[PDB]
Every structure is written in C-alpha cells, then in structure tokens.
Design a protein around this ligand. Structure first.
Ligand SMILES: *[C@@H]1O[C@H](CO)[C@@H](O)[C@H](O)[C@H]1NC(C)=O
Lengths: 40, 39, 166, 240
C-alpha cells in the first residue's frame, strides 16, 4: 500500500559546506508527509 | 593493352617474392598501385 | 555498477541456497559495455537516485532502527555516496531482491519507493554542516511562513507568504 | 594583488596506454585494431618523452596542451606498415595505405605516432603475418575498415571466386626481413582520436601547484577560481 514520508527524503543538494545556517534550495526532493509506496 | 602488362607485373611481383626477392617484390607492389590508379 | 547493454530476465534476481548466492537470473546480454565499476529491522538504508545532466547520483545513509514496519519518524541527512557520468535516459527502474530458493520464497524485508518532485526546502545546517532539520516550503501554510521568514521559528504576527490566484 | 597563482587538482587513476603501445602483437593495417579509452587519467608526457618515436604529429591539439584537457573518449587505432608508408597516415593523403587500408578524415582531431619495430616484426626468411590490401574498387571512407577477402576483378571476365588472369587475391603480405632497408622495414603506428561530444569528458590529462599558506594568491581548486589568503581551519567538513 502506501506509508507517510514524514521528514525523510532530505539529501545534501551539493558538495557545499554550510555551518550553523538555514539554506533555501529548490531541487528534486521527496515532499514531506507524502505517500511512499511500500512493498514487503 | 593495359591488362596484359598488369598480369605480367603481377606475375613478376609474385615470382620475385617466391625467389626471395621480398624487397623488390614490394617495389613492384607499389607500381601496381600507381598503375591501376591511372585512367 | 554497469552502464552497459543488458537483456533483463522476466523476473530478475539473485538466488540464495542454504546461505550462499548460487543463481544470477538478471540478464542474458552484457554487450556495448560502456561503464564498469567495482566498489566497496536494525538497519535502514536510504538511497536517492537522481539522473541529471547525464550524471547519475546515489545518496546513501545508514540508520539504526527498531520499528517493526513502515518508515520510522526521524530526520537523517542523506550524504552523497556515489556520482557517475552515465549519460543515458533513465525512465523506469526495478529493485532486485534476493529471492531464496525453497519455487521461490523470500525472507522478511520491506522496501519503500518515493518519487522526487521539484520542491523548495529550507535546510538547517548545524555547526558540523550536517542537515539536522528541514522545512518543506509547500507542505503547509506554517511551513510557507517558515520558508518566507528564512527562519525555523516565526515570531508572533502576520506574514505574507505567497499570492493566491484562480 | 595576488603574489602568485596556485592550481590544485585531485592527486591524479590511469589510462591503459601501455597495453596499446607495448602490446606484443599488432594488427595488420587492412584489419586495424581500435581500442576505446574512457573513464581514466592519462599522462601524455609519458608518451612524448618515450624517446624512439619516428613520427609524432598532432593535428587539432598539441601534446603539452593534452595533459591539461579532458575528452569523452579516446580511440587508439593501431597497426603495422612500412616506413615509407608512414607519411600516408595523415589527413589529405593518398596512396596504397590511405586509399585501401586506413584513412584519416580531412578534419582529423588527434595524434599520429609511429616507431620502427624491425627488432620485433621482421623475421629471417620474412614475416608473412602482416598484410595490406593492394586492390580495391574505390577508396575507403575515413575510419572505414574492409576485412573482406574477395577475388578482385581487374579485367573484363568475372572471377567466380577463383584467382587467375586478372583475378587477384586482394591482400599481400609484407614479408618483413631484418635485412630490408629502413623505408621497407616495419613501423608500429598508433593513431589517437580525441572525441568531445555533448557529454561528460571522463578521459583527463591538468596540473598541480605547491600549496602556499597565509599569502594573497589567485587559487584554482578543481575549477573553483578565486583570490585570497589560505589559512588553517577548525571547520569539520563532511567527507563529500
Ligand atoms: C561536530 O559535532 C560534535 C557533536 O559531538 C561537536 O562536539 C563538534 O563540536 C562539532 N564540530 C564542529 C567543527 O562543528
């Protein structure tokens, strides 16, 4: 069926190092709390 | 004509090689190339 | 990892016999082989596969988990594990499972697939540079406010985030 | 102003040129060998410093420029011909080799490299393993390979697959012997083709400069060009 993504699916957008800062990036990300298809 | 002599030059290329004149054979090889290129 | 011409089997897999992998029912063709790479539940393995500008990238993360089923609720940054210059169209994919030979019965496991979408994310990089939290700018109006303020905490008040149009 | 420029590039894998240039047996020119080179780093000065090369000419590139460039693929074509024929391996050439065996395009991008292989490829009594094509109806196109073995028809009568009057087997052996003059001795040839498509360039020559610290310099780190002073840091960068 399907499951909730929650906050998973976040990856570093690039090889850039940022410390103690909030960065806004537009990229191919998994939407939060989206339906993820699960298989067993 | 052109064909008689072509055959004769081919034959001498081959006979040159068979009698151990490899280098000379190669030089006739080159003549065959140039001669067949002409009109 | 091989970027090469393969004719996949109808049900490709690796068959394990009691445990050692004894069968390789994956492909019948290994031709025009452009690229070959040999590289190095209590375990959660997360992989992001993105094929962009001809480069295919795998982002991998390991998480110690104790949930019986489904995605545990948590935050984990997905470090880029491998990036390769592939340059071929990728429209479909298929995971290969280790279907043990009993007639094939597989051991208990779960795999989850999610399709990435173009989204704006506000990532909180800590002192180490690790992403410790993220905000999906389109998830909800509170998240839109957090993205607009460029802050994970918004002060009391009214904020203009976007424009509604029909 | 920056005192001096420093360029930093990863340590610098390897391309298997040794296997091309130091192969035991080479191909006959009519059936020339092609090796695709990709996904690797090449030191081309290892090439241009190997001392016994009788020919070494590049056409749309330069040897020292090579060790700084990246390409999508490099193709290494290789064969044996006579010394006097080496000059036909060049754009715009005609002759028995260029016409009927191995043909470069007018717009060639790469290097032609040759050396004398008399010690390896000549035999007392003649080495008949190396062949060329003497007869063909028309010229090869660039990078065409013709390995057919059909009786060539020089005259008016069809050959019907039998050699005879004006019906010639189309290939000859060189029969290289060590007593031949140098023009007739065997030369090994490597043609390098440098291909740049709209794609990642994964066959890479560049340069590495000594690092300088606490000095105003113009630095180039893997394509990141900037100016400043480089000092020790306490930031724990993640490995990626
Ligand atoms: C990395 O994280 C650890 C947490 O144990 C912390 O003690 C350390 O100061 C951090 N290092 C940097 C450079 O931010």
């Amino acid at each position: 069926a399907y499951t909730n993504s929650f906050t998973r699916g976040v990856y570093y957008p690039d090889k850039v190092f940022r410390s103690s800062v909030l960065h806004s990036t537009q990229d191919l990300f998994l939407p939060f709390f989206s339906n993820v298809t699960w298989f067993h | 004509d052109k064909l008689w002599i072509l055959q004769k030059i081919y034959e001498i290329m081959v006979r040159l090689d068979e009698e151990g004149h490899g280098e000379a054979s190669l030089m006739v090889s080159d003549l065959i190339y140039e001669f067949m290129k002409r009109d | 990892i091989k970027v090469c011409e393969f004719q996949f089997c109808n049900d490709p897999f690796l068959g394990v016999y009691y445990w050692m992998e004894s069968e390789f029912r994956v492909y019948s063709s290994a031709n025009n082989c452009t690229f070959e790479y040999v590289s190095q539940f209590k375990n959660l393995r997360e992989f992001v596969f993105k094929n962009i500008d001809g480069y295919f990238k795998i982002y991998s993360k390991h998480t110690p988990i104790n949930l019986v089923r489904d995605l545990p609720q948590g935050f984990s940054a997905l470090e880029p594990l491998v990036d390769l210059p592939i340059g071929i169209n990728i429209t479909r994919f298929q995971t290969l499972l280790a279907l043990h030979r009993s007639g094939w019965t597989a051991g208990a496991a779960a795999y989850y697939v999610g399709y990435l979408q173009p989204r704006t994310f506000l990532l909180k990089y800590n002192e180490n540079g690790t992403i410790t939290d993220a905000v999906d700018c389109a998830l909800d109006p509170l998240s839109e406010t957090k993205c607009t303020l460029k802050s994970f905490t918004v002060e009391k008040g009214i904020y203009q985030t976007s424009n509604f149009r029909v | 102003q920056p005192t001096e420029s420093i360029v930093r590039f990863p340590n610098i894998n390897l391309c298997p040129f040794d296997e091309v240039f130091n192969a035991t047996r080479f191909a006959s020119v009519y059936a020339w060998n092609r090796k695709r080179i990709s996904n690797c780093v090449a030191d081309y000065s290892v090439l241009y410093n190997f001392a016994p090369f009788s020919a070494f000419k590049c056409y749309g590139v330069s040897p020292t420029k090579l060790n700084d460039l990246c390409f999508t693929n490099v193709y290494a074509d290789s064969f044996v011909i006579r010394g006097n024929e080496v000059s036909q391996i060049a754009p715009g050439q005609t002759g028995n080799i260029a016409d009927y065996n191995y043909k470069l395009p007018d717009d060639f991008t790469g290097c032609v490299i040759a050396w004398n292989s008399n010690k390896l490829d000549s035999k007392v009594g003649g080495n008949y393993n190396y062949l060329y094509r003497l007869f063909r109806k028309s010229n090869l196109k660039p990078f065409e390979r013709d390995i057919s073995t059909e009786i060539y028809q020089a005259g008016n009568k069809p050959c019907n697959g039998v050699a005879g009057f004006n019906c010639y087997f189309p290939l000859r052996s060189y029969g290289f012997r060590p007593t031949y003059g140098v023009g007739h001795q065997p030369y090994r040839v490597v043609v390098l083709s440098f291909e740049l498509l709209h794609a990642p360039a994964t066959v890479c020559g560049k340069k590495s400069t000594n690092l300088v610290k606490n000095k105003c310099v113009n630095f180039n780190f893997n394509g990141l060009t900037g100016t400043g002073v480089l000092t020790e840091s306490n930031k724990k960068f993640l490995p990626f």
